[PDB]
Design a protein around this nucleic acid. Structure first.
Ligand code: SSA
Ligand code: SSA
Lengths: 442, 319
RNA sequence: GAGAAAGCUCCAUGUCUAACAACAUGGCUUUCUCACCA
C-alpha cells in the first residue's frame, strides 16, 4: 500500500541506512514538540510520543542483540558449549524478525519528521512572511499595462491558444524574440556565475524515488505533484522536480575533499511539475531554470554564509536585468520538510498586479545530507556530514512575464534591457514581420 | 550507402587511442560509476570542462543558425499521443522509444522523444502565409530516448537516455524542389559547422526510414572508438507530417495545401563530445580545445582538475 | 531495451552449522544471447 523507498533501500543494502535526528532532540520533548507544531508538517506533536517509544524499544532490542552476538562470538572463538551455541542461535533467529519489524515501523514513522527551524524564521502564513528589502520601483505608465499573455499573443512570441490537443492544459510555446530572450537569460546567468567561479554541471532529468525522498519531496502520494513514469514501461523512475534533486543524487553516497569545500555547481535543466492560473505563464507544467546548488563546510556558519552569497547573486542578477524585486523571508509554516531557512524573491508584475515568487533558496544543512549520506572527509580522515544549500538563479516563465510587462509600451513594442541587448542585438522589439498562424481546425 | 563527401584528415597519434570514458574519468569531466540507483542506468553527469563544452557547442551552433535567419523556438516537453502518431513514432508497441507517463496519474502524456515532435505540434492545424515560406526555426531542448542498447558498448557515453540535441525544422513551399533545396541548404549548414569544429567526418546517403522521403547521415571519425559513429541525421519528408497532422499552408490564391517538412540536427552534445575529446587527445591525457570554441571555453588547454575526485563510501565496496 | 549465465571487477537478507564455508533470494561488477537507433 504505502511504503518508503529509503527503508527499502537500506533493507536491500543499496545504501547505508540514514542517521536520524530523533536522538538529537530526544533530550527535551517540549522543544521538539513546539518546533514541529510551528512547522506544522504532516507529523504532529500529538503523534511524537509513539515514535519516541518505538525508538526506545528498538534501542533496547538492538542492545540485547549485540550482547547475544558478543556471547556467541566468544563461545565460537573459544571452541574454535555446542548446546549453548545452538540455544543462542535459536534465540537470535527468533528475535531477529521482531526486531526488523520494529525497525521498519519506527523508521517509517520517523522519516516524516521535518528538519530544525531557524530561530529567526517568522511563524505564520505567506502573508505573515517578513520582507527583507525591495530594489527598484514600479515603472510609471501613462496607460494600464496589458497582460503578458496578451502581449505575447499580439507579438506572436508566446502561443498558448488551442494547445489542449497537442500539449495538454497549461502548455506554452516560445517564438521569435521570446525564444531569444529565454536563451539570452539562461546564457547571461550562466556566464555571470561562471565568471564568479561556479563549476558547471548537468543533471539527468529522470531520477529514482530514493533520491527524491532524500531531497524531501513526496514521490508518491494521492495529491503528489511529481510525474512518475508508467511502471510497466519502467520502474521507480520519476521526472526531476528541480535540478537540485539531480545534483543531490549525483552527490549521494560520495565524499569530497575538505580543501574543495565549498563546492558550487550551476546546472541548467528542464523541470516538470504536475501543479495539480487558468491562463498565462504563471503556472506551467514544464519550464527551464538555471539552478545553483552548493555543498558547504560542516560549520553552520559556513552554510549560512554560502546561502547569503547565493542571495547576493540573485539580487545582483535581478538588479542587472532591471526588474523591480522584493526579497522576503519565508515563514515557518511554508518552510517545508527539507528546508531550514528559505528566502523568497518576488518580482513585480504590472499586468498581474501582484508580486510573483520567482527565486527560492533553501538550507538543507541536516536533512538532505543525512538522507543521502553525503559526507565530507576531513584531512585527519574523519567523515563529517556536509550542509547543502540550493537556490534558483532564474526561471524563464516568471522572468519573461516580469520583463515583458515591465517593458511594454503603448505601441505594443517591448523594450529590452541593456544586459540582454547584446544577446538580442535589437534595443527593442517590434511587431513580427512574419504572418501569424491561421487556425484551420474544424 | 553512397559517400557523398569526405572532409578532413585522420589525426596521427604515436600512442594508442584512448576511450572517451577513460579520458573523461581521468580528467573527471564525466562520472558514470555506481549511478544505477541515483539516475537509473546508462545516464551520465558532465562536470567541469565537459559542461562548458556542452553549453558552448549549443550556443555556438545557435549563434551560427541565428545569423542565417533561423527563427528561434522552444517546444513543450510533454506531448500528447496524437502528436507522436503524426510524427511517425508510435507508443502503442511494447518496445518504444517514448517514455509513457502513468495513465492513472495523467492521461495520454508522453515525454518528447525529440524536439521535432514539439515543433510539429506547434504547426498542427494551422495555416502559414505564402510569403513567410520558407520558414526555418531552431529549437534546443533535452530529448529522452526510452531504450538505449546495452549489448554493445553499454558502459559508454555514446548511447544515453537523455541528451541535449539542437533541432532545425523548416517548412517549405508546395514544390518538391523547394523542400529538396531546403534540405540541401540544411546539409551545407551542418557540414560548415562540423568543418568549423574541425572533426573529420564522412556524409553518406541512407537507402530509401519509412517517414523520410530522402535521408542524409553524417558520421564523424572518432579515434578512441576506432570506428565511424553516426552523429547527425537530416531526413526530408514530403506531405507526411502535415498530411498526418492536417497541417496546411495558404498560398496567394488562398487554396489550402499541405506544406512539406524538413528536419535536421544541428548538433548533439554526446557524440560531439566523444569526437572532440578523442580527436585532440594528447600524451598526458590533456585534450586540446579547437580555436573556434576557445572563446566559449576560455581555456586554451584542458588540464587535470584541481579539485580532488569524489571517493565512494557506499556499502557495495570490498573491505 | 528484453532474456539468460557467472563471481568477482564483490555487498546485503535467509536455510543446516559451536562457527568459517557451501547452496538459495536479491543488489553490484563483468561476460553471453535476441532486439530498436524516427
Ligand atoms: N507551476 C510552476 N510553473 C512554472 N514555474 C514555476 C512553477 N512553480 C515555481 N516556478 C518557478 O520555479 C522556481 C522554483 O522554485 S521552488 O520549486 O519553490 N524551489 C526549488 O526549486 C529549489 N530546488 C531551489 O534550489 C520558482 O521560484 C518560480 O520561479
Ligand atoms: N541514445 C542516443 N543518445 C544520445 N544522442 C543520440 C542518441 N540517439 C540519437 N542521438 C542523437 O540524435 C541524432 C539523430 O539520431 S535520431 O534521434 O534517431 N534522429 C533525429 O533526431 C531527427 N529525426 C531530428 O532530431 C544522432 O546523430 C545523435 O546526435
Amino acid at each position: 500500500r504505502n511504503r518508503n523507498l529509503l527503508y527499502e533501500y537500506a533493507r536491500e543494502g543499496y545504501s547505508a541506512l540514514p542517521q536520524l535526528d530523533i536522538e538529537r532532540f530526544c533530550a527535551c520533548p517540549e522543544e521538539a514538540a513546539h518546533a514541529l507544531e510551528l512547522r506544522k508538517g504532516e507529523l504532529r506533536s500529538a503523534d511524537l510520543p509513539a515514535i519516541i517509544s518505538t525508538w526506545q524499544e528498538l534501542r533496547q532490542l538492538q542492545e540485547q542483540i549485540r550482547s547475544l552476538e558478543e556471547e556467541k562470538a566468544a563461545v565460537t572463538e573459544a571452541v574454535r558449549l555446542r548446546a549453548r551455541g545452538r540455544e543462542i542461535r535459536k534465540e537470535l533467529v527468533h528475535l531477529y524478525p521482531r526486531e526488523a519489524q520494529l525497525e521498519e515501523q519506527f523508521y517509517l514513522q520517523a522519516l516524516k519528521l521535518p528538519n530544525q527551524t531557524h530561530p529567526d524564521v517568522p511563524v505564520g502564513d505567506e502573508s505573515q512572511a517578513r520582507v527583507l528589502h525591495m530594489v527598484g520601483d514600479k515603472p510609471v505608465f501613462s496607460f494600464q499595462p496589458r497582460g503578458h499573455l496578451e502581449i505575447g499573443e499580439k507579438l506572436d512570441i508566446i502561443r498558448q491558444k488551442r494547445l489542449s490537443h497537442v500539449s495538454g492544459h497549461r502548455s506554452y510555446y516560445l517564438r521569435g524574440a521570446g525564444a531569444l530572450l529565454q536563451h539570452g537569460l539562461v546564457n547571461f546567468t550562466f556566464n555571470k556565475l561562471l565568471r564568479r567561479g561556479f563549476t558547471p554541471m548537468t543533471v539527468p532529468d529522470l531520477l529514482r524515488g530514493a533520491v527524491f525522498e532524500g531531497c524531501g519531496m513526496t514521490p508518491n502520494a494521492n495529491p503528489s505533484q511529481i510525474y512518475n513514469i508508467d511502471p510497466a514501461r519502467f520502474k521507480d523512475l520519476n521526472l526531476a522536480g528541480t535540478a537540485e534533486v539531480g545534483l543531490a543524487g549525483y552527490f549521494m553516497d560520495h565524499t569530497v575533499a575538505f580543501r574543495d569545500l565549498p563546492v558550487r555547481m550551476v546546472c541548467s535543466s528542464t523541470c516538470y511539475r504536475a501543479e495539480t492560473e487558468p491562463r498565462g505563464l504563471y503556472r506551467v507544467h514544464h519550464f527551464t531554470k538555471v539552478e545553483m546548488f552548493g555543498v558547504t563546510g560542516p560549520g553552520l556558519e559556513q552554510s549560512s554564509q554560502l546561502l547569503e552569497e547565493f542571495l547576493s547573486l540573485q539580487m545582483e542578477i535581478l538588479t542587472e536585468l532591471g526588474l523591480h524585486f522584493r526579497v522576503l523571508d519565508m515563514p515557518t509554516q511554508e518552510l517545508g520538510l527539507p528546508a531550514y531557512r528559505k528566502f523568497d524573491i518576488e518580482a513585480w508584475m504590472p499586468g498581474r498586479g501582484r508580486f510573483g515568487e520567482v527565486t527560492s533558496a533553501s538550507n538543507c544543512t541536516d536533512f538532505q545530507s543525512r538522507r543521502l549520506h553525503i559526507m565530507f572527509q576531513t584531512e585527519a580522515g574523519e567523515l563529517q556530514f556536509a550542509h547543502t544549500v540550493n537556490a534558483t538563479a532564474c526561471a524563464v516563465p516568471r522572468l519573461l512575464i516580469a520583463l515583458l510587462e515591465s517593458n511594454q509600451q503603448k505601441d505594443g513594442s517591448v523594450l529590452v534591457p541593456p544586459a540582454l541587448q547584446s544577446y538580442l542585438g535589437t534595443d527593442r522589439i517590434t511587431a513580427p514581420t512574419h504572418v501569424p498562424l491561421q487556425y484551420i481546425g474544424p | 550507402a553512397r559517400v557523398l563527401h569526405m572532409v578532413g584528415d585522420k589525426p596521427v597519434f604515436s600512442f594508442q587511442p584512448r576511450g572517451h570514458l577513460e579520458i573523461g574519468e581521468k580528467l573527471d569531466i564525466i562520472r558514470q560509476k555506481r549511478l544505477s540507483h541515483v539516475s537509473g542506468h546508462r545516464s551520465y553527469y558532465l562536470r567541469g570542462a565537459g559542461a562548458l563544452l556542452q553549453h558552448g557547442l549549443v550556443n555556438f551552433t545557435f549563434n551560427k543558425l541565428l545569423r542565417r535567419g533561423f527563427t528561434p523556438m522552444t517546444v513543450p516537453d510533454l506531448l500528447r499521443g496524437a502528436v507522436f502518431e503524426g510524427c511517425g513514432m508510435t507508443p502503442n508497441a511494447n518496445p518504444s522509444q517514448i517514455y509513457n507517463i502513468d495513465p492513472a496519474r495523467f492521461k495520454d502524456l508522453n515525454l518528447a522523444g525529440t524536439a521535432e515532435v514539439g515543433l510539429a505540434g506547434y504547426f498542427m492545424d494551422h495555416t502559414v502565409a505564402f510569403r513567410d515560406l520558407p520558414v526555418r526555426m531552431v529549437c534546443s531542448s533535452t530529448c529522452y530516448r526510452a531504450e538505449t542498447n546495452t549489448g554493445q558498448e553499454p558502459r559508454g557515453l555514446y548511447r544515453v537516455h537523455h541528451f541535449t540535441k539542437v533541432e532545425m525544422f523548416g517548412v517549405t513551399g508546395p514544390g518538391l524542389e523547394q523542400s529538396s533545396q531546403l534540405l540541401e541548404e540544411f546539409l551545407s549548414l551542418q557540414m560548415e559547422i562540423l568543418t568549423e569544429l574541425g572533426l573529420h567526418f564522412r556524409v553518406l546517403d541512407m537507402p530509401t526510414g519509412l517517414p523520410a522521403y530522402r535521408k542524409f547521415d553524417i558520421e564523424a571519425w572518432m579515434p578512441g572508438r576506432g570506428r565511424f559513429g553516426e552523429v547527425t541525421s537530416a531526413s526530408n519528408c514530403t506531405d507526411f507530417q502535415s498530411r498526418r497532422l492536417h497541417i496546411m499552408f495558404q498560398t496567394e490564391a488562398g487554396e489550402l495545401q499541405f506544406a512539406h517538412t524538413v528536419n535536421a540536427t544541428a548538433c548533439a552534445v554526446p557524440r560531439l563530445l566523444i569526437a572532440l575529446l578523442e580527436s585532440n587527445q594528447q600524451k598526458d591525457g590533456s585534450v586540446l580545445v579547437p580555436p573556434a570554441l576557445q572563446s566559449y571555453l576560455g581555456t586554451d588547454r584542458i588540464t587535470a582538475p584541481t579539485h580532488v575526485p569524489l571517493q565512494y563510501i557506499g556499502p557495495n565496496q570490498p573491505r
